[PDB]
Design a protein around this ligand. Structure first.
Ligand SMILES: C[C@H](O)c1nc2ccccc2[nH]1
Length: 147
């Protein structure tokens, strides 16, 4: 009996159980703690060549592959989790969304407004929690639920 979307798994490298959320792609060692009309989220977007618009304020022509975008996302998540970098800092510097200029903040939103995988992950995140890689037609997202 775990919160929405969580399941038990076993580490291949360590053998210790961990928890994975199939809506948010979050993964963690600790057992998860546990819906509002609106949530507030920030995100860091890494676009790729198959993004709906392969262009951003960082790059007129985004040419990186989906796999390359995912590896960038993976490295940002690693540095956020290690404390080496802050989400807001990486979003401001590297997000391919115009919300980079607001440290990735998108403001508050309801169901029905965002692309569905983004929405589902946002609403399955607890306040303060961060997603793993979330895939949409825009690219690949790291989502931070702030409210
Ligand atoms: C103080 C902060 O937690 C932090 N985490 C780090 C990870 C790698 C290198 C430097 C780092 N500084």
């Amino acid at each position: 009996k775990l919160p929405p979307g969580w399941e038990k798994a076993m580490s291949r490298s360590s053998g210790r159980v961990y928890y994975f959320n199939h809506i948010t792609n979050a993964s963690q060692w600790e057992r998860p703690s546990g819906e509002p009309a609106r949530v507030r989220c920030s995100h860091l977007l890494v676009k790729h060549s198959q993004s709906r618009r392969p262009s951003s304020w960082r790059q007129e022509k985004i040419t990186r592959t989906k796999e390359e975008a995912l590896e960038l996302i993976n490295g940002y998540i690693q540095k956020i989790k290690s404390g080496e970098e802050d989400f807001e800092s990486l979003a401001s510097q590297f997000s391919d969304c115009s919300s980079a200029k607001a440290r990735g903040d998108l403001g508050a939103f309801s169901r029905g407004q965002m692309q569905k995988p983004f929405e589902d992950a946002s609403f399955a995140l607890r306040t303060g929690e961060m997603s793993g890689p979330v895939f949409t037609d825009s690219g690949i997202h790291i989502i931070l639920r702030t409210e």
